Structure 1
Amino acid sequence: GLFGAIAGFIENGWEGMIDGWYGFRHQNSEGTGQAADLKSTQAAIDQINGKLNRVIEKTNEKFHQIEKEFSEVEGRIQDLEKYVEDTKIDLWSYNAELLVALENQHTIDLTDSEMNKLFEKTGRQLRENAEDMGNGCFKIYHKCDNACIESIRNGTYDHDVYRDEALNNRF
């Protein structure tokens, strides 16, 4: 994708992340665990459903049209009926093809972005207390128990509390 997160610096997806699209995996002094991130998960889902609903909205209603099958050769008038119809179908078919190519490219790039956006947000909370290991993981340079990790996950992590500890360990 354009952002290089999904199928990029994130090496692979997590088959085991079954209650969210994006999330956190951790290891600390109390062991390891997993949690979906709801805001990013919900961000991808809402965009895709909005998009999906735009696409499947409002078929046209048509009633009396033209004949499209013919049991006798007639020539000029039939040729025109057949040409008009044939042309219409190819145009719609192109539209259909184009619609999905652009939509799918866009669905992929927006999901990659959400991954990247979650990652950047995590980095920003951590300030100087962690370093990006380059594989979508942060090495956190201080003691950080389950409540601390959760403090990161729920967006209330207070970097100042841990800053002294972390910098000494980093440097």
Structure 2
Amino acid sequence: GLFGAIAGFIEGGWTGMIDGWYGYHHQNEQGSGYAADQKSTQNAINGITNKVNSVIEKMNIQFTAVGKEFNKLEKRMENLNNKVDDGFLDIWTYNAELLVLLENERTLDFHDSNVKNLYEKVKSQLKNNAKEIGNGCFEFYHKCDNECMESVRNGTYDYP
């Protein structure tokens, strides 16, 4: 998308991730497994939950909208009524499809942002001990444990 991580430097998402939206996959001597990075996933879930709440909150619930009859010598006032009902329904249909296209683009850009933020925090952390291979994958120069893979999840990792 707009940050080149989703559909970009990482070729595709992993179906073995179910725990969260952003996560890692280790290949230790201790074996392999998918493990979500909780802080980035939960912060994204809060950002998505707040937008989901906001777009539902901003419309106020439609009260009783009842049609009005006009006689044979009130067809001008029927054409005023019809113009008012049509013109409001036009604007409200336009506002609904506007915010759907715009915010669905911004959502995919926001998730693509969070995957590059996940990659750059690991690059700045692993530094001189690892190189890039599959664009996302970091071969270590010293071979450290699944405890030390968890030290890259929480973002401590005490070795330059």
Normalising by structure 1, we get a TM-score of 0.84
CA deviation string 1:57-104 (max 9, x = no partner):
153356576x54648654211011101110110001100110111111
Could you say which residue in structure 2 is the equivalent of 1:35? 35
Q: CA deviation at 1:16?
A: 1.3
Could you say which residue in structure 2 is the equivalent of 1:109? 109
- Following the alignment from structure 2 to structure 1, what is the Cα–Cα distance between the partners of residues 35 and 64? 56
Could you say which residue in structure 1 is the equivalent of 2:9? 9
Deviates more, 1:103-112 or 1:28-37: 28-37
Q: Summarize the alignment of residues 56-67 of structure 1 with structure 2, pairs less than 5 Å apart.
A: 56-60=56-60
- Following the alignment from structure 1 to structure 2, what is the Cα–Cα distance between the partners of residues 64 and 149? 59
Decide whether aligned partners of structure 1 residues 86 and 121 sit closer, same or farther in structure 2, where only a CA change above 3 A counts.
same
Could you say which residue in structure 2 is the equivalent of 1:131? 131
- SS for the counterpart of 1:34 is strand
- SS for the counterpart of 1:127 is helix
Question: Which of 1 and 2 has higher RCO (CA within 8 Å, sep 6+)?
Answer: 2
Could you say which residue in structure 2 is the equivalent of 1:143? 143
CA deviation string 1:101-146 (max 9, x = no partner):
1111111110110011011000010111111225321222221222
One-letter amino acid of the counterpart of residue 122, structure 2: T
Could you say which residue in structure 1 is the equivalent of 2:118? 118
The runs of 4+ residues in structure 1 deviating greater than 3 Å are: 61-65, 67-74
CA contact (8 A) 2:16 2:34 kept: no
RMSD of aligned residue pairs (Cα, Å): 2.0
Q: CA deviation at 1:46?
A: 0.7
Report percent identity of matched pairs: 58
One-letter amino acid of the counterpart of residue 122, structure 1: V
- SS for the counterpart of 1:148 is helix
One-letter amino acid of the counterpart of residue 112, structure 2: D
Unaligned runs of 5+ in 1: 161-171
Could you say which residue in structure 2 is the equivalent of 1:23? 23
Deviates more, 1:84-93 or 1:49-58: 49-58
Normalising by structure 2, we get a TM-score of 0.89
Q: CA deviation at 1:33?
A: 2.1
